[PDB]
């Protein structure tokens, strides 16, 4: 369709001490935010398989579509997001966030 | 669904002196690889608008769809991919490369 939505992309490396089970629980709890935060519509994620970034070893990629930058910002400040981010902040070693409208 | 795909995600920062005209031509030549490299099925890209990692400087996000990790390898070793790097490596400052299958 003709819509102009905005994708929120998260690129993450967990601390080495975090176990696979802990990463899974972190992602599951994150996905549950869709049911809580109005702006947050859907979550797709995946684990990188090629490990091509050397000293910048991000492993997980999360994609969330939103209607605009302003509603991304609503998600950022929503108390369920603030709470998730604060209590799991020690899980990650590196985090990059991008917001863009995909085009051809 | 019935189809299998792997997303090849590139995060890119151009050198600071590169012009907008140069970026546009660089991207047009990259997306034209779909007409050259069989494995490369589609490209969507966008420019970050929120600058949440401004200090790292990545600005462009490029999403390329492939059938499998094997066809991704065919893309990497294709002469036109090697040749794109021959001609344009001097335009980028840094990159991150990921290969993953998005899921819920
Ligand atoms: C399954 C991956 C979970 C990602 C948590 C990141 C939370 C966060 C922290 C922050 O300092 C800035 C942010 O923009 C965000 C975010 O966008 O969600
Ligand atoms: C408009 C996007 C331009 C992307 C060029 C990156 C080329 C490249 C360089 C490299 O050193 C390693 C790689 O894996 C790749 C790649 O995946 O294409």
User: Which residues, including other chains, have CB under 8 Å from residue B65's CB and lie 6 or more apart?
Assistant: B5, B6, B7, B8, B41, B42, B43
**Alpha-carbon distance B12 to B73, whole Å?**
20
**Alpha-carbon distance A104 to A56, whole Å?**
28
**Alpha-carbon distance A20 to B11, whole Å?**
25
Nearest ligand to residue B29 Cα:
2
Say how many Å lie between the first and final Cα of chain A, rounded. 14
Per the CB < 8 A criterion, the answer to whether A5 and A67 are in contact is yes
DSSP states of A65-100 as a string? Answer: EES-HHHHHHHHHSHHHHHHHHHHGGGEEEEEEEEE
- Residue carrying the six token digits 């601390």: A15
Q: For residue B101, what are the CA distances in angstroms to A88, B19, B42, B66, B104? A: 24, 34, 15, 10, 10
Nearest to A67 by CA among A2, A1, A3: A3
**Alpha-carbon distance A58 to A43, whole Å?**
18
**Alpha-carbon distance B63 to B93, whole Å?**
19
**Alpha-carbon distance A78 to B26, whole Å?**
39
Q: Give me the residues of B, 31-50, that contact A with CB < 8 A.
A: 31, 43-50
| Contact at CB, A69 and B50, closer than 8 angstroms | yes
Contact B33 CB / ligand 2 (< 6 Å): no
**Alpha-carbon distance A104 to B43, whole Å?**
7
**Experimental technique of record:** X-ray
**Alpha-carbon distance A66 to A25, whole Å?**
23
Work out whether the CA dihedral A96, A103, B63, B75 comes out positive or negative.
negative
Nearest ligand to residue A87 Cα:
1
Per the CB < 8 A criterion, the answer to whether A60 and A46 are in contact is yes
Per the CB < 8 A criterion, the answer to whether B53 and A96 are in contact is yes
Task: Find the Cα–Cα–Cα–Cα dihedral B48, B32, A64, A53, rounded to 10°.
Answer: -80
**Alpha-carbon distance B100 to B95, whole Å?**
16
What size, in residues, is chain A? 104
| Beta-bridge mates of residue B103 | A45
| Beta-bridge mates of residue B12 | B60, B95
DSSP states of A13-48 as a string? Answer: EE-TT--HHHHHHHHHHHHHGGGT-TT--EEEEEE-
- Residue carrying the six token digits 């792997």: B6
Per the CB < 8 A criterion, the answer to whether B12 and B66 are in contact is no
Per the CB < 8 A criterion, the answer to whether A7 and B49 are in contact is no
Mutate to test the pocket of ligand 1, among A97, A99, A100 (most ligand atoms within 8 A of CB): A97
Mutation choice for B interface testing from A64, A99, A104 by most B CBs within 10 A: A99
**Alpha-carbon distance B66 to B21, whole Å?**
28
The total domain count for chain A is 1
Range of the domain at B51: 1-104
Mutate to test the pocket of ligand 1, among A95, A96, A99, A100 (most ligand atoms within 8 A of CB): A95
Tokens of A59: 């492993």
Per the CB < 8 A criterion, the answer to whether A25 and B86 are in contact is no
**Which long-range contacts (C-beta less than 8 Å, at least 24 apart) are formed by A35-41?**
A36/A78, A36/A80, A37/A74, A37/A75, A37/A78, A37/A80, A37/A81, A38/A74, A39/A66, A39/A67, A39/A71, A39/A72, A39/A74, A39/A75, A39/A78, A40/A64, A40/A66, A40/A75, A40/A81, A41/A65, A41/A66, A41/A67
| Contact at CB, B31 and A69, closer than 8 angstroms | no
Contact B27 CB / ligand 2 (< 6 Å): yes
**Chain A: closest CA distance from residue B8 (Å):** 9
- Name the pairing type of β-strands B92-100 and A60-66: unpaired
| Contact at CB, B103 and A11, closer than 8 angstroms | no
């Amino acid at each position: 369709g003709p819509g102009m939505a905005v994708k929120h992309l998260i690129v993450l490396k967990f601390k080495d001490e975090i176990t696979e089970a802990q990463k899974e629980e972190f992602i599951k709890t994150y996905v549950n935010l869709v049911n809580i935060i109005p702006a947050m519509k859907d979550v797709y994620w995946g684990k990188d398989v090629t490990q091509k970034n050397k000293e910048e070893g991000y492993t997980h990629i999360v994609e969330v579509t939103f209607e605009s930058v302003e509603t991304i910002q609503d998600y950022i400040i929503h108390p369920a997001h603030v709470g998730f981010g604060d209590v799991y902040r020690s899980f990650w070693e590196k985090l990059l966030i991008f917001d863009y409208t995909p085009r051809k």
